[PDB]
Amino acid sequence: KAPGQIYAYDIHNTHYPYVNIKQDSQTQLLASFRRSIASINPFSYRQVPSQDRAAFGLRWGNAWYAPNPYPNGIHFDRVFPTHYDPLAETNRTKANLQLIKYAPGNYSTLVVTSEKLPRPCIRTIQNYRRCQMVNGTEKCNSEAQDILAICPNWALDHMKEKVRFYTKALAINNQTYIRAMQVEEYNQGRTVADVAPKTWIHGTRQHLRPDTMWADDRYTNITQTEINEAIKRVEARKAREHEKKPVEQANVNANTGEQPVRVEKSLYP
Amino acid sequence: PVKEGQAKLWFSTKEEADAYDDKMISNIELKSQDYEDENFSPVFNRKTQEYFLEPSEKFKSDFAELLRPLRSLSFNQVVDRYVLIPPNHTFYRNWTYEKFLGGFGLSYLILRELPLRNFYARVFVMYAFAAKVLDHLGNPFPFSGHGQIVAAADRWNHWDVRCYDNVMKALKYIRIPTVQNNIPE
Amino acid sequence: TIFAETWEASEYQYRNKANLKTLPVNHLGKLAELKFDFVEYKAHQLIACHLYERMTIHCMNQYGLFKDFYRPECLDAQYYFKTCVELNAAYGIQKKFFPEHFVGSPYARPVPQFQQLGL
Amino acid sequence: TLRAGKNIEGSGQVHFGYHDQKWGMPAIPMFQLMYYELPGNSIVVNPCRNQNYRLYFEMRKKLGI
Amino acid sequence: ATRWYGRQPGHLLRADTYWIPNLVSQRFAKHQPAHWDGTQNMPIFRLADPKHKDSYMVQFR
Amino acid sequence: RMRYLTEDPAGDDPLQKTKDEHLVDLGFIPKVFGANVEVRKRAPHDKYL
């Protein structure tokens, strides 16, 4: 009847790994001393949990450690506008009552959840499907009316909206299907037979050279003489390609009192 | 002259390739470290080899050291070992917190008996001891707030309240208020 | 998916719900907290969540995963990277199936057709 | 209430608008005899929960314990 | 509709002796004629909006 | 012009508006229109600001 141990216990083989995040000499020396006497030290605290004993988290000196919250620009002012920028400081300064309040969930992520419908409403749905596959849809009127009556209205609204969402997602997935299965002009008339016997590694740096000059030793033996000659050849080709240039279009956002178009920004200011 | 290697280009014809080499070579800016050179640059000397970020041996050796107890085991042994731990809810798991935090009170018994002669010198000692506690307790006044202890995450967190649904929503979910500012129906 | 290095913040804020999180750009200041020497190109620091990924590698190469990687500059990078890809995965999904929730979408507050005005 | 999805402007329960208020039990015997505060320790799990132990007594006999 | 009409900013006088920078700068300002352009909304003064560049020192509460 | 083009989100309560479930039972089946995504809001002449 031995207590159960978690996977982390087999990595360290002890319950007393004195992990302190503060990288000061006083702290790491004391931890090494405390890490060695943890077997016979009464002032020992566990950091690896077990079935029989809970544990503490990572230590920060005498206090406890927690990562800096992910940057969040949302804040709430009290006295004056602070213009809080989470990217201007490494560690987030504490929130003073008269200065700022930060957003909730210092350590939180975005997820999607769903409420659990009432148990009696679920049993009426089970009875409808069961009577459906057995007796057919046309003979499930009594089971359908029990749903509309026993299930509270807030649940019927959820059921009504689930159908509209999945109908929306169904279209969003089929539009991606259409864009994905579209045959571009550079693949017209090409099939699996015209495919090359290559794998992912054949498009990597070892087999496919990147578009940079110093990725390998290709251009390491080039001299200034060869460069001046190459500049002359590229300029020769430009004697035939520069003949064409796109025409300047009108500025759709010329009027400042008009909602501008979110047009692609220029590469450079 | 152009050098060949294992890394090849992506052009079908040789003219497109030569056009690519001429385009790249026309953009080369040589920077030599030796005087008497038409292309001389003491500072701002460009390197001629590109750096590539790869996982080192210290990187791949520690990730393999994490899986040492799994290579010696079969899948059924792993489940019976780390997953199917026999249920035993008789242990006093929170003894770890009682011992640690209860030591403050036991430590105060021994610390309040210091043979320091000056009364104001023990004022300093107790001020330092209170600082050690207040790093965890936070607020010194009673009926004001709660202490702050970071604990390890394990499968037995909140094990005896997993049956309750409202406890999960309060701990886990931070709901986003809508324009129709109301609690969900 | 974002097919650029820069994105408009307002495009990832909600229009009919309270805004409690933003989608900030990479925190370039965390890159100066690495004490060791490393090579980082400026062409990779703007793309979302990749800077925190490369930093984690640099820290996992200089140090390991035991008793030396456990320093504040290296753990915050690992936490940021893990958190950045989770938030971006959810925002990307929410943009794919719930584009009407965000500012800039023409479906957050649809403009009616002229046939609906009765003129 | 905030965490459940309801943002709160202002604070307190002294509703300025069209709502019912409850000021607090006047500390005089008249109201202290009619009213008493809700004791949380009186809200309990239904004892029907204990009837699920019948399953255990039947299993112990089936396994020969 | 009511909120929208309320954001249409009102007219706030530029004259200000309460902010010491204007108390000094306006002593050197030259009052030029504002020729009527045919409207009833000529913003020849500052605007009663917190975000206006000449009214940000004012506390709208 | 900016405050003329400064709107608030969500408009007014849709529940205070005529329902489509009621028009059906009254004898008129409404036709569903799409969103007009090609119009750009602009401010009027200065005289109307």
């Binding site: 004056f80 506008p81 213009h83 008009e258 909602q259 | - | 009919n16 | 402007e9 | 206006h52 | 900016m2 400064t6």
Partner: peptide, 23 residues
């Protein structure tokens, strides 16, 4: 939802000044 929330359709530039917030 935040009381001081506004949706603007034209670009604006905010001042990055201490103690003040304006266009």
């Amino acid at each position: 939802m935040q009381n001081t929330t506004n949706i603007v359709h034209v670009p604006v530039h905010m001042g990055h000044t201490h103690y003040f917030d304006y266009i």
